Amino acid sequence: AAQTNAPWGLARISSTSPGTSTYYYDESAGQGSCVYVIDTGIEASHPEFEGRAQMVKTYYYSSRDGNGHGTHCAGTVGSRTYGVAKKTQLFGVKVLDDNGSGQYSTIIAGMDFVASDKNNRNCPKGVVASLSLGGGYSSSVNSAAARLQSSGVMVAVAAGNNNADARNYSPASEPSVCTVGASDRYDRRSSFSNYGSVLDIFGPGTDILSTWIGGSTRSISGTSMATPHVAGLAAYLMTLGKTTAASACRYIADTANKGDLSNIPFGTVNLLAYNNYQA
Template sequence: MLGNDNGVSRRNILKLAGASVATAAGSGLAAAKPGDTVEVNIGFSSERGRSLALDAADHVVRDFDSLNIVTLRAAKQAVTALDKNPNIRYVEENGQMHALAQTLDWGQDRIDSEVAHANGETGAGADIAIIDTGIDDDHPDLSANIGSGKSFVACSTKGGCRYGAKPANNTCNYSWTDDNDHGTHCAGIADAVDNSQGVVGASTDATLHAVKVLDKCGSGSFSDITAGVEYVADQGWDVGSMSLGASSGSSALRDACQYAVNNGVFLVGAAGNSGPCTDCVGYPAAYPEVMAVSSTNSSDGLSSFSSQGPEVDIAAPGTDIYSSVANGTYDTFSGTSMATPHVAGVAGLLMANGYTNTEARNQLASTAEDIGLGSNESGAGLLDAAAALGLDSSDST
């Protein structure tokens, strides 16, 4: 729920949780016997050096004309001798680097998203609208899934914001480009591509739509948001994810929510970050048309900031969630804002299988896991993607 997320956990960009680029170590070359064939990169400083390197080669793998480098295979004793020649800048083993690992965030693991993916459930064919600050249109984890966008507020990264909010370091390629980070973070949780880098979403192959109703400072009027919800309904999209809210409601926005649900949209909203509190669910999540989501931590407890109340329908992970942010990077945020797109992504999986919005909502509630929290805290329980799809949570192969 934007507006109350300030001050909660926000970790360093590109925090990779141990994933790193492997160094091209020289242990293979060092361990080789003199007559063994090794593959090396040789940097030379003159044509004489280049000739010496090529003369030593059993096989030339690649010749970098512009860089004064050749990659070749040769006997170890031949390349070792080259390393002492003044025309040779260096001889190094042609080691390997590895792609940065893709992270399965604890939240996705907790709701068994990976079980759904392993069983071919990717959300292909579903349309998920992120009603938020926009989406980073060229983020490597999102761009393949982005369908279209619409903006009801201006995209701008110039100037500051009141209350300490900071615009994202991004370029407004489109009017709906994310200039804040928040919408991109939510989009990654809902539907980041399974591409061996960055993060993976609850859904991985649904079509994402950026409906920008919040500006660079994370603010939007009731009218802006109402227009966004109406627009989603008029497009015939399946899911509208709203990680936004206020302590008071709006009749106009309530009308739009009713209109959207009547037109087949599954609406999900953040319960709010006013906790610890009771009976404090914000709007639009408090409307009966919207599935209200509270937040849990990695210990299955209610997040300290999560709002509670009888309007809460379901809980999902929301503390320290690692996902995409603007400018093609990643960060860790906390909030019911982060819990909400978990539900949106799983709803996308269901609606890709032909569920209506009402059926998807009922299925999510009826298959939620009891984690011992009260209904005022977690509604029907914790979101369970595998159970919602009728899958065995142990079947992830």
């Protein structure tokens, strides 16, 4: 398939060069996979989700996304126009309130919920969780991420937006999950992106157009936007049978565009997510 005038991030993950605007991808489009977006919620009624999104859990007074952040992430995973895996199933878990904040115990509770909830769901091609959140180092938050990964879910988490070593943030610092840094449309590390040996991969994270609440759209920046590119790519690759939940992060690293990013510090991988789609 080929989406012309795609958001630059989608085009980027299907090219060996920056500056294209066509997203080339296999038409299976992540059908049969499921991605849990653990965030502020998802506006499931947004037309861009085509009825493929649903809230399954909230930890607050409402299931609604009163922020937009979770809807934006969910749109980069699997919305029609802005999504990597345009036929995946999306499940919303609201661990962050409408200001984008969440306590660590609630985040941990949400991760354990997904590890069990995925046994209620028909996801024959496998299950992904995208966690565009984090905070200061916590061994309990890391273990929760690791438990989710161990249960059979491909966990992708944001490196963080502190322009610092992500070893000091969680779940970013958990070695067994996929930690995602952010890049811009000129293949530079995003100015805010964390770095460090704990990063496994970079994805597009600066000026990312996606769905927003109120049936709208907007462009925002963050490792929070890079994370769902990788989560959507994993769901897409697991639908193609090229990898599994346990190996997707390694597989994405192995097949990444290598050495193409600038302003990567020594000790941080120079790997940019890439679908290697050959039409």
